Design a protein around this ligand. Structure first.
Ligand SMILES: CC(C)(COP(=O)(O)OP(=O)(O)OC[C@H]1O[C@@H](n2cnc3c(N)ncnc32)[C@H](O)[C@@H]1OP(=O)(O)O)[C@@H](O)C(=O)NCCC(=O)NCCS
Ligand SMILES: CCCOP(=O)(O)OC[C@H]1O[C@@H](n2cnc3c(N)ncnc32)[C@H](O)[C@@H]1O
Length: 633
């Protein structure tokens, strides 16, 4: 049944159950008053007058918030805190090696961001230019992002785990002018060859836009160097002035791109602007994590993903929080690592992923052995569904039965939390995201777009805009309309399925499109198919997800070879390595199913549902039996 709000939370919560109901209803009935007042969570250089100005209508998808106002994201995350809180830790950095760590005051963070901003400008970088950031979990990644935002440059963070080919792709689509990386990343006592990956990516003859590469000496390893192109981070920043006066950006000036896998084609750059995004990130962070000054906060998400943008850096810093940046993996060297970090830094709010929770739970009490955990007050979960027994293990083992768990459902296209508990306001059901946040109107529709009311299930749509909504796909607004606003007209389609129970709670069941969730990573099946088919021995491929006790879904690839070609264990490894090279280790098929029996319709279209069910272990009609025999082997 429900978990009641505990008294300690009741005594402190910013939002109680009555306040939730009042605010939500105003957020929907009168969003201009509600967000007009709520926008004051930030400092504006010139105040807005218009608040909500959005349309989801066919041929007129247009989203604007606070449009006539100006601000600077770097000033809201840094400058404004300096006067009263400049000595406060903005970022606690915990190294993969626990003997290495740092506390970085707001004043120290501000200074390096000013220096790096001048560094960028001196390099000929201007407002509107795209800057690729391919960084490990080090504070210099945050410096780079915040300095881009300060000067109105549009950063494009590329997750460090992508391959040279995945990196080149992103640089080409975005016309990145600059690449910011490190000699090597460090993760689980191991090096990641980031700069060398950059070298390989930049040899792709279709990469034409890049003028420099800035390189942080993280490990001091021997690397190759291209004179003139390659610049050391330290060389540049030490010669830069610490004085930088921030200019006003418009609320709708582009802030960042994030490449996101979709149901069809290669990943596209989900674009966020400035005002609405930052208002929404700060508002959701504060209310949902019940942030009180002095609260130590740790989100485990990588900087390379939206969770890392909104809830490691932007939400927290705007709010004047201490946010923890962990360099490593929550279970290395031992499964107790995560909770040792909590004890070490007296962390009060912990926000992580179900895959991580499941990985720790497999280790049982080894995940908590020798650790206290008493500083914790709030837990959270993001990225994927969480089953009740993982939710209960997390709530009992990590939170000592004392901490509410906020299961936050949202996406890269939403900027911030969409459906989530608030810890002082909403009683928890293990596995449920619960109720919509302020300004969020979910609905469920069937495949024909018919709204489904009460306790039912359907396709999860949002029926109006909210301040943190992505504004477009980089260079392709028509695709943006087509992808999200064309299936169910006048509505934003999330691509997820959900049920709503008799209490009005949402239970997110997962993607209903051809998108996979693998270790809490969003990947398209079509893009893995392309990677595979690009192999010179492969003619066809069909990728499906299957359940996996830790990963959530594993990648199961049915593969048809060019005629005359034979399978082998050599070829098996080689085809996995092939995808590892095309995209990255994150997209590596778990299973390869060699077949000549791909099930096609009368018009040659792949019957995915049957592949899915067969892989899950349970025209030319004969193919099913051959597929089942093969699967059995
Ligand atoms: C559970 C988890 C901690 C396990 O991590 P893991 O032990 O490294 O295993 P993963 O499946 O994640 O990674 C697979 C590979 O990618 C590599 N990798 C992972 N993150 C990397 C990074 N940041 N940079 C470079 N390589 C990375 C690993 O080293 C591994 O490589 P290998 O096969 O050569 O050994 C991790 O998958 C995780 O935190 N996922 C949740 C995602 C999330 O945070 N959700 C919300 C984000 S929006
Ligand atoms: C939120 C950070 C992840 O952003 P991405 O844009 O990479 O992925 C969004 C998708 O992750 C799943 N998802 C995310 N959170 C949840 C969640 N809390 N419960 C169930 N599924 C979730 C949903 O399917 C969603 O469409």
């Amino acid at each position: 049944h429900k978990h009641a709000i505990p008294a300690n939370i009741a005594d402190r919560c910013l939002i109680n159950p009555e306040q939730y109901e009042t605010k939500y209803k105003q957020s929907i009935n009168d969003p201009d008053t509600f967000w007009g007042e709520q926008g004051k969570i930030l400092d504006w250089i010139t105040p807005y007058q218009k608040v909500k100005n959005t349309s989801f209508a066919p041929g007129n998808v247009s989203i604007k918030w606070y449009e006539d106002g100006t601000l600077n994201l770097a000033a809201n995350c840094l400058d404004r805190h300096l006067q009263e809180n400049g000595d406060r830790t903005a970022i606690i950095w915990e190294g993969d090696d626990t003997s290495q760590s740092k506390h970085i005051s707001y004043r120290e963070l501000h200074r390096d961001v000013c220096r790096f901003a001048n560094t960028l400008l001196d390099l000929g970088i201007k407002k509107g230019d795209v800057v690729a950031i391919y960084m490990p979990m080090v504070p210099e990644a945050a410096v780079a992002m915040l300095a881009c935002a300060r000067i109105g440059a549009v950063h494009s963070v590329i997750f460090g785990g992508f391959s040279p080919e995945a990196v080149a792709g992103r640089i080409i689509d975005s016309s990145s002018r600059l690449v910011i990386t490190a000699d090597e990343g460090v993760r689980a006592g191991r090096s990641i060859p980031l700069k060398k990956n950059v070298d390989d990516a930049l040899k792709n003859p279709n990469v034409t836009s890049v003028e420099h590469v800035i390189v942080l000496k993280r490990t001091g390893s021997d690397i190759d160097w291209q004179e003139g192109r390659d610049l050391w981070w330290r060389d540049l920043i030490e010669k830069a002035s610490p004085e930088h006066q921030p200019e006003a950006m418009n609320a709708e000036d582009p802030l960042f791109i994030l490449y996101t896998s979709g149901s069809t084609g290669k990943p596209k750059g989900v674009l966020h602007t400035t005002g609405g995004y930052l208002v929404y990130a700060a508002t959701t962070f504060k209310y949902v994590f019940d942030y009180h000054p002095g609260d130590i906060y740790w989100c485990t998400a990588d900087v390379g993903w939206v969770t890392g943008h909104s809830y490691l850096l932007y939400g927290p810093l705007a709010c004047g929080a201490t946010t923890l940046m962990f360099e490593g993996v929550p279970n290395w060297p031992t499964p107790a690592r995560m909770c040792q970090v909590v004890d070490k830094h007296q962390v009060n709010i912990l926000y992580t992923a179900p895959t991580a929770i499941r990985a720790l739970m497999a280790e049982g009490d080894k995940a908590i052995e020798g650790t206290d955990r008493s500083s914790l007050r709030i837990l959270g979960s993001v990225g994927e569904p969480i089953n009740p027994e993982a939710w209960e293990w997390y709530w009992k083992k990590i939170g000592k039965e004392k901490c509410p768990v906020v299961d936050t459902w949202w996406q890269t296209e939403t900027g911030g939390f969409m459906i989530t508990p608030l810890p002082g306001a909403i009683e928890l059901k293990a596995g449920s995201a619960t109720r919509p946040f302020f300004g969020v109107q979910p609905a469920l529709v069937d495949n024909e777009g018919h709204p489904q009311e009460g306790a039912t299930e359907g396709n999860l749509v949002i029926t109006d805009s909210w301040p943190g909504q992505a504004r477009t796909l980089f260079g392709d607004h028509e695709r943006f309309e087509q992808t999200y606003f064309s299936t169910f007209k006048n509505m934003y389609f999330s691509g997820d399925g959900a049920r709503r129970d008799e209490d009005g709670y949402y239970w997110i069941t997962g993607r209903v499109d051809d998108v996979l969730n693998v270790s809490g990573h969003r990947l398209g099946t079509a893009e893995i198919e392309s990677a595979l088919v690009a192999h010179p021995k492969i003619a066809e491929a069909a990728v499906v997800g299957i359940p996996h006790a830790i990963k959530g879904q594993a990648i199961y690839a049915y593969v048809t070879l060019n005629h005359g070609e034979e399978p082998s264990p050599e070829l098996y490894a080689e085809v996995r390595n092939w995808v590892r090279k095309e995209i990255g280790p994150l997209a590596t098929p778990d299973v390869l199913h060699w077949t000549d029996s791909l099930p096609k319709t009368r018009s040659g279209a792949i019957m995915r549902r049957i592949l899915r069910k067969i892989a899950a272990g349970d025209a030319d009609p004969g193919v099913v039996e051959k597929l089942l025999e093969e699967k059995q082997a």
